[PDB]
Amino acid sequence: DPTIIIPKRANIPTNDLAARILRDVKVELVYNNSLHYVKIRASVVLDRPAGQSTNAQTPMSSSAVGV
Amino acid sequence: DPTIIIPKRANIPTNDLAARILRDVKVELVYNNSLHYVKIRASVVLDRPAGQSTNAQTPMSSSAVGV
């Protein structure tokens, strides 16, 4: 999310009140990106594809073994 | 305070008792005064005013050194 910050009067040095110029205003942004290159991976099958695994469990995220 | 003075009989010269006229009655007064002219001294501040002295003592009247 874009952000904007403005300093308060108590934080302005006395010198700037004579110069009458404010400083330290800050803004932030995130730039998008276009797409330049793409790489694809195809596959071809000739004979009868082999039967797939018949597991119906919901795939677990990671191994439980950890110490 | 206004003052009034009246002489006594013993102090009246014999001649006035024949002339039958009294003298030497005295009165005093103090007159007030109007205001005619006024002079002012202003001041302006631009930057942050400097911090004042932080003395909390009751201001002394006059220097003790005297011989």
For A2, the 3-state DSSP assignment is coil
Residues of B in contact with A14 (CB under 8 A): 47-48
Which residue type is seen at A7?
A: P
Structure tokens at B6: 């009246």
How far is Cα A18 from Cα B45, in angstroms, rounded to an integer?
11
How far is Cα B48 from Cα A11, in angstroms, rounded to an integer?
12
Residues of B in contact with A17 (CB under 8 A): 46-48
Q: How far is B52 from chain A (nearest CA, A)?
A: 16
Structure tokens at B36: 């005619």
Method: cryo-EM
From B26, B24, B4, B29, select the one nearest B13 (Cα to Cα): B24
How far is Cα B62 from Cα B67, in angstroms, rounded to an integer?
14
The chain A residue lying nearest B45, using CA atoms, is: A18
Structure tokens at B23: 């003298």
Q: How far is B41 from chain A (nearest CA, A)?
A: 24
